[PDB]
Amino acid sequence: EPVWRSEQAIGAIAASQEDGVFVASGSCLDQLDYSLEHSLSRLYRDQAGNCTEPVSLAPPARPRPGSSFSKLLLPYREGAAGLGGLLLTGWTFDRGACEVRPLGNLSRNSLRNGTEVVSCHPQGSTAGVVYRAGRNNRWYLAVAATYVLPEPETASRCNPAASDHDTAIALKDTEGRSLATQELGRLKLCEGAGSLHFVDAFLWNGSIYFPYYPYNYTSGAATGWPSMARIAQSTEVLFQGQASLDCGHGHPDGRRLLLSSSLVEALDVWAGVFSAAAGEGQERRSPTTTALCLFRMSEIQARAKRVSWDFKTAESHCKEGDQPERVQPIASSTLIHSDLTSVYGTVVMNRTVLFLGTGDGQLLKVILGENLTSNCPEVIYEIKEETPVFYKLVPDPVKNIYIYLTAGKEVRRIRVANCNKHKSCSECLTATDPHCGWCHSLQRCTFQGDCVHSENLENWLDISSGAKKCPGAP
Amino acid sequence: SIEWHKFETSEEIISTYLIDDVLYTGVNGAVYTFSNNELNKTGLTNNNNYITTSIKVEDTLVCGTNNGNPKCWKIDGSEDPKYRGRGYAPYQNSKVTIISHNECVLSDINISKEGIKRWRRFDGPCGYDLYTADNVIPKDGVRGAFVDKDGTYDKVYILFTDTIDTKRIVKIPYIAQMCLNDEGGPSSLSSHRWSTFLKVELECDIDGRSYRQIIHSKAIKTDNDTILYVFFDSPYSKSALCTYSMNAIKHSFSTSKLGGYTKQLPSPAPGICLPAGKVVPHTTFDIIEQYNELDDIIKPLSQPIFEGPSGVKWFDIKEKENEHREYRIYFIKENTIYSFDTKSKQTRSAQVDARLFSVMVTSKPLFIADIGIGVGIPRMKKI
Ligand SMILES: *[C@@H]1O[C@H](CO)[C@@H](O)[C@H](O)[C@H]1NC(C)=O
Ligand SMILES: *[C@@H]1O[C@H](CO)[C@@H](O)[C@H](O)[C@H]1NC(C)=O
Ligand SMILES: *[C@@H]1O[C@H](CO)[C@@H](O)[C@H](O)[C@H]1NC(C)=O
Ligand SMILES: *[C@@H]1O[C@H](CO)[C@@H](O)[C@H](O)[C@H]1NC(C)=O
Ligand SMILES: [Ca+2]
């Protein structure tokens, strides 16, 4: 399988539909081909040449959120031909600047750019997503970041102005100058609550969702329950609610850190990898510290109330009222594991497929059955060096059979399943993996694309038909 | 002497404005117009709709509070194609300072039902939406505002009284400036805020009496410069009027240092307007918002400076018959009209059986009251 290495740790990874795979390591962005061997173009954001981390970041506890220079990498306007692809590239450089660029060649010039769009702190969180809103249905960017953090020297001081000291989520107009944010286009943080660490940002049902959790960056501990904020998909901020995520199932002390986030679009179910504290070094490790939980988005929407707890509201101060409602993650769909760090979920034939990353470099795969019940995970790939997997697992937009595995300074192109390992029809269809099927003409278990199809014959036997439908069936 | 054009019944006066020499009086439910001695009335949605504003944009616009949902209408009823009202009228009956220069609207009217007082510039000919930083504008709001040139650039000047609660509750009067065509911030977050806003303390002391609460203001352009008349109130028995030279004020904003900032100021000073398209730098914007007050206090011109009585709510000026570059200052209370002669320094008073609201001078002084509008002054005696 293909592999790409960098001199610096990878901070962000995103794959364009038609244009190459974009990867950001130190202070540079690389446009790689889908085969991960040819760098089509590069972007020296800090200084021409040297991509060495202008500074140095010490990767804390494996459960603690990491530090990075790249804060935002989002390809957009790539659905169909006629408009042209655009790319949003954000960083900690220039007070958390973000620029809009032509999706493709990095040597080209950026169209618009603005400062204070993203968190200027290397360890500060940032999660953004592009959406459509307004009369003309224009493109807007919604960004949630930890903009304010305790900083000593005023020579570097990048914290936003006093009027913007409490801003948590901000809406930007992509066509507007400096990616302008309007007066009523921001959600503010409730004071004294400490800091909020945003994990992801996604669109679902007319609203934008922001998975996060209260986090003290100084002490390195979670000061609350992991939650999700909901806002309407509009030009101005309309707070719709806040709900806590409960995934402390197999753990006696509970799990307060959300490490990875993935929305299963065809299922309307959100997948999250939760974890408890690891002592500090990696002390309190246990076969129950991390877990995978699936939440019904309709339950999140229903339980998210416009109460002021982590965010300021109109007729409520802060924490002087009702508490946020908790949401349960679908029983028996939970996967308790010792060290999970990343997740990506999709629906193949009709079954829910979940890819999991671990702290020792394993890429696991879980296929849900009847009632979204979880089976025993299959190890699809293992990293030689045992490098913990990056919290973002990116699928291949061109080939459905591939998934990009990122860890440390390496990006690999991994096949979603090992079909050829099976050498019998029954032996292969009992495995119940929607990606694999018995190809009658070649007498091998393969992907749908590896087997020749014809309308007059049934050459590729899928899982839905059953193992009993094999030619030799007892 | 005084010709009263009475309404059909006593009205609650909410606001009065002058545009094309036409007096626009806003009442609870309707709006009256007055010009060429004829009174015209156009009734609007009658309930608890307080008409607080009458401005001149591309057309005459009249806005009201409705039943908690601000809306604007055309002079002769109508719908208003622009569908504005949000920042054009408050949600509750209150004082308002909204002005329109050419077609650019500047207002202190709350944009939402949840307080947060700001001085804003809406999207138009002068640029897009702009608003002041947090707590810059007091809960009392802006008391007066006008547009005046400073070089080749137009600037907006506003007056307001700030309350400071450190050890004691102290009120302080200020005059602030900003560029009419100010682009805005330089970040994404501050792109819609004023980048040239500065303020200076105003002084109006007579004999130990230090006036702080601003009531009304009027700016008159002369040959040399612009003279700003400001009437102050006090929790005691007297009120007072002080005048200021706009040239002196412009000099101060232009050359005076910033209180609290001892380091060197940037090549292009903080409150200086930039050419169309140019944006104020980050280093400059960081200073201006943290140090927006000058290390100075503007002293008033020697004359005119007079006092009493407390309770004044409005005033207007009229030049004393082209033979004298002197003036007659008319100001009012609840049931009394006053006139101050700047040459003789004599003040007269006249009682009326009406609840007075304002004095707006055109060719003759108009007195807007709950009963109607009185054209011309009554026979006054030396108070
Ligand atoms: C570039 O890399 C060098 C190592 O050769 C490193 O020491 C330096 O910090 C980097 N310079 C920058 C900031 O681009
Ligand atoms: C980046 O944007 C700023 C204004 O936001 C502009 O001054 C600068 O020229 C832009 N850079 C390029 C080359 O696009
Ligand atoms: C943040 O951490 C510091 C020390 O690490 C502590 O003083 C402070 O109380 C913490 N904030 C909260 C409420 O978690
Ligand atoms: C699977 O697909 C069938 C159609 O073949 C549909 O009826 C069923 O609802 C789907 N099951 C789920 C919920 O995955
Ligand atoms: Ca869906």
Short mmCIF file of N, CA and C in Angstrom, two decimals, chain B residues 136-138 140-144 158-164 169-177 197-206 209-217 228-235 240-242 244 249 253 292-294 296-300:
data_model
loop_
_atom_site.label_atom_id
_atom_site.label_comp_id
_atom_site.label_asym_id
_atom_site.label_seq_id
_atom_site.Cartn_x
_atom_site.Cartn_y
_atom_site.Cartn_z
N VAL B 136 -18.76 51.02 25.16
CA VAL B 136 -18.25 52.31 24.72
C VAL B 136 -19.35 53.36 24.88
N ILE B 137 -20.54 53.04 24.38
CA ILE B 137 -21.68 53.94 24.47
C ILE B 137 -22.48 53.56 25.72
N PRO B 138 -22.74 54.54 26.61
CA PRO B 138 -23.48 54.41 27.87
C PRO B 138 -24.93 53.95 27.70
N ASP B 140 -27.30 55.41 28.75
CA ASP B 140 -28.11 56.61 28.56
C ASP B 140 -28.21 56.89 27.06
N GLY B 141 -27.26 56.35 26.30
CA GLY B 141 -27.27 56.52 24.86
C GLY B 141 -26.63 57.80 24.36
N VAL B 142 -26.70 58.03 23.05
CA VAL B 142 -26.14 59.23 22.43
C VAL B 142 -27.18 60.35 22.55
N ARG B 143 -26.75 61.55 22.95
CA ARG B 143 -27.69 62.66 23.12
C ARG B 143 -27.76 63.56 21.90
N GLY B 144 -26.69 63.58 21.12
CA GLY B 144 -26.69 64.42 19.94
C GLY B 144 -25.65 63.91 18.98
N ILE B 158 -20.50 62.79 17.97
CA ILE B 158 -21.59 62.45 18.86
C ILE B 158 -21.29 62.90 20.27
N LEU B 159 -22.36 63.14 21.02
CA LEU B 159 -22.23 63.59 22.39
C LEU B 159 -22.99 62.64 23.28
N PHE B 160 -22.43 62.35 24.45
CA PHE B 160 -23.10 61.46 25.39
C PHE B 160 -22.49 61.64 26.78
N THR B 161 -23.25 61.26 27.81
CA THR B 161 -22.80 61.36 29.19
C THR B 161 -22.59 59.94 29.72
N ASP B 162 -21.37 59.68 30.16
CA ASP B 162 -21.01 58.37 30.68
C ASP B 162 -21.05 58.37 32.20
N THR B 163 -21.49 57.27 32.77
CA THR B 163 -21.53 57.13 34.22
C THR B 163 -20.41 56.16 34.60
N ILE B 164 -19.58 56.57 35.56
CA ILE B 164 -18.48 55.73 36.03
C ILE B 164 -18.72 55.40 37.50
N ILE B 169 -20.44 57.35 42.21
CA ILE B 169 -21.10 57.37 40.91
C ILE B 169 -20.88 58.75 40.29
N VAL B 170 -20.06 58.82 39.24
CA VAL B 170 -19.77 60.10 38.59
C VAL B 170 -20.13 60.14 37.10
N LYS B 171 -20.82 61.20 36.70
CA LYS B 171 -21.21 61.37 35.30
C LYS B 171 -20.17 62.23 34.60
N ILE B 172 -19.89 61.92 33.34
CA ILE B 172 -18.90 62.66 32.56
C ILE B 172 -19.39 62.89 31.13
N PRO B 173 -19.36 64.15 30.65
CA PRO B 173 -19.81 64.44 29.28
C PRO B 173 -18.67 64.24 28.29
N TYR B 174 -18.98 63.77 27.08
CA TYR B 174 -17.94 63.51 26.08
C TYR B 174 -18.41 63.87 24.68
N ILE B 175 -17.44 64.06 23.78
CA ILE B 175 -17.69 64.34 22.37
C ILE B 175 -16.80 63.28 21.70
N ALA B 176 -17.36 62.48 20.80
CA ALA B 176 -16.56 61.47 20.15
C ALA B 176 -16.57 61.71 18.65
N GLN B 177 -15.52 61.25 17.98
CA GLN B 177 -15.41 61.44 16.55
C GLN B 177 -15.11 60.12 15.84
N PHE B 197 -12.72 55.68 16.05
CA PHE B 197 -13.45 56.25 17.18
C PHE B 197 -12.55 56.76 18.31
N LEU B 198 -12.75 58.02 18.70
CA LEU B 198 -12.00 58.65 19.79
C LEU B 198 -12.97 59.57 20.53
N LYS B 199 -12.71 59.81 21.81
CA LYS B 199 -13.55 60.70 22.58
C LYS B 199 -12.75 61.59 23.53
N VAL B 200 -13.29 62.77 23.82
CA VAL B 200 -12.66 63.73 24.73
C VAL B 200 -13.68 64.20 25.72
N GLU B 201 -13.21 64.53 26.91
CA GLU B 201 -14.07 65.03 27.95
C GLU B 201 -14.42 66.49 27.66
N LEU B 202 -15.65 66.87 28.00
CA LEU B 202 -16.13 68.24 27.81
C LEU B 202 -16.25 68.92 29.15
N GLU B 203 -16.00 70.22 29.19
CA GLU B 203 -16.15 70.96 30.44
C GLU B 203 -17.14 72.11 30.30
N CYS B 204 -17.94 72.29 31.34
CA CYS B 204 -18.91 73.37 31.40
C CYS B 204 -19.11 73.64 32.89
N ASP B 205 -18.19 74.43 33.44
CA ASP B 205 -18.20 74.83 34.84
C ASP B 205 -18.37 76.34 34.92
N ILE B 206 -19.08 76.82 35.93
CA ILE B 206 -19.29 78.26 36.07
C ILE B 206 -18.70 78.82 37.37
N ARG B 209 -19.83 74.94 39.99
CA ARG B 209 -20.88 74.06 39.47
C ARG B 209 -20.35 73.35 38.23
N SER B 210 -20.23 72.03 38.30
CA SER B 210 -19.72 71.26 37.17
C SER B 210 -20.85 70.45 36.56
N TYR B 211 -21.30 70.87 35.38
CA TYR B 211 -22.39 70.21 34.67
C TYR B 211 -21.92 68.99 33.90
N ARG B 212 -22.63 67.87 34.08
CA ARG B 212 -22.25 66.61 33.45
C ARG B 212 -23.27 65.98 32.52
N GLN B 213 -24.54 66.06 32.89
CA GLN B 213 -25.61 65.48 32.09
C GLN B 213 -25.97 66.29 30.85
N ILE B 214 -25.75 65.72 29.67
CA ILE B 214 -26.08 66.42 28.42
C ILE B 214 -27.55 66.22 28.06
N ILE B 215 -28.20 67.29 27.62
CA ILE B 215 -29.61 67.24 27.23
C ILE B 215 -29.79 67.28 25.71
N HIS B 216 -29.29 68.35 25.10
CA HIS B 216 -29.47 68.58 23.68
C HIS B 216 -28.24 69.28 23.11
N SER B 217 -28.04 69.17 21.81
CA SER B 217 -26.90 69.82 21.17
C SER B 217 -27.28 70.32 19.78
N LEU B 228 -20.51 74.58 18.38
CA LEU B 228 -21.36 73.57 18.99
C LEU B 228 -21.99 74.02 20.31
N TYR B 229 -23.31 74.12 20.32
CA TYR B 229 -24.05 74.54 21.50
C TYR B 229 -24.54 73.29 22.23
N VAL B 230 -24.23 73.21 23.53
CA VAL B 230 -24.63 72.05 24.32
C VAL B 230 -25.34 72.47 25.59
N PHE B 231 -26.55 71.98 25.80
CA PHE B 231 -27.29 72.31 27.02
C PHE B 231 -27.14 71.15 28.02
N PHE B 232 -26.74 71.48 29.25
CA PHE B 232 -26.55 70.48 30.31
C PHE B 232 -27.58 70.64 31.41
N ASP B 233 -27.85 69.54 32.11
CA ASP B 233 -28.82 69.53 33.20
C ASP B 233 -28.04 69.17 34.45
N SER B 234 -28.69 69.26 35.61
CA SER B 234 -28.07 68.92 36.88
C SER B 234 -29.16 68.46 37.83
N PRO B 235 -28.81 67.63 38.82
CA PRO B 235 -29.81 67.15 39.78
C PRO B 235 -30.17 68.23 40.78
N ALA B 240 -27.48 74.53 32.25
CA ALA B 240 -26.48 75.44 31.68
C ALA B 240 -26.17 75.15 30.22
N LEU B 241 -25.76 76.19 29.51
CA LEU B 241 -25.41 76.05 28.10
C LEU B 241 -23.99 76.55 27.86
N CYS B 242 -23.18 75.70 27.23
CA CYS B 242 -21.81 76.05 26.91
C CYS B 242 -21.60 75.89 25.41
N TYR B 244 -18.70 75.43 22.12
CA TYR B 244 -17.36 74.93 21.85
C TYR B 244 -16.96 75.16 20.41
N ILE B 249 -11.64 71.47 18.90
CA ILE B 249 -11.89 70.05 19.14
C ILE B 249 -11.14 69.20 18.12
N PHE B 253 -8.19 66.24 18.89
CA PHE B 253 -8.23 64.85 18.41
C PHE B 253 -7.03 64.55 17.52
N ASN B 292 -9.02 54.85 23.71
CA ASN B 292 -9.87 55.65 22.84
C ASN B 292 -10.17 57.04 23.38
N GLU B 293 -9.72 57.32 24.60
CA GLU B 293 -9.95 58.62 25.20
C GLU B 293 -8.68 59.45 25.19
N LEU B 294 -8.82 60.73 24.85
CA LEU B 294 -7.70 61.67 24.81
C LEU B 294 -7.29 62.10 26.20
N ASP B 296 -7.01 64.91 27.50
CA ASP B 296 -7.34 66.32 27.41
C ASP B 296 -8.78 66.55 27.83
N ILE B 297 -9.14 67.81 28.07
CA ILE B 297 -10.49 68.17 28.47
C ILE B 297 -10.75 69.49 27.75
N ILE B 298 -11.77 69.51 26.91
CA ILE B 298 -12.13 70.69 26.11
C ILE B 298 -12.86 71.79 26.85
N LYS B 299 -12.22 72.95 26.96
CA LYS B 299 -12.79 74.12 27.62
C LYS B 299 -13.74 74.84 26.67
N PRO B 300 -14.83 75.39 27.20
CA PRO B 300 -15.81 76.10 26.37
C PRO B 300 -15.37 77.52 25.98
#
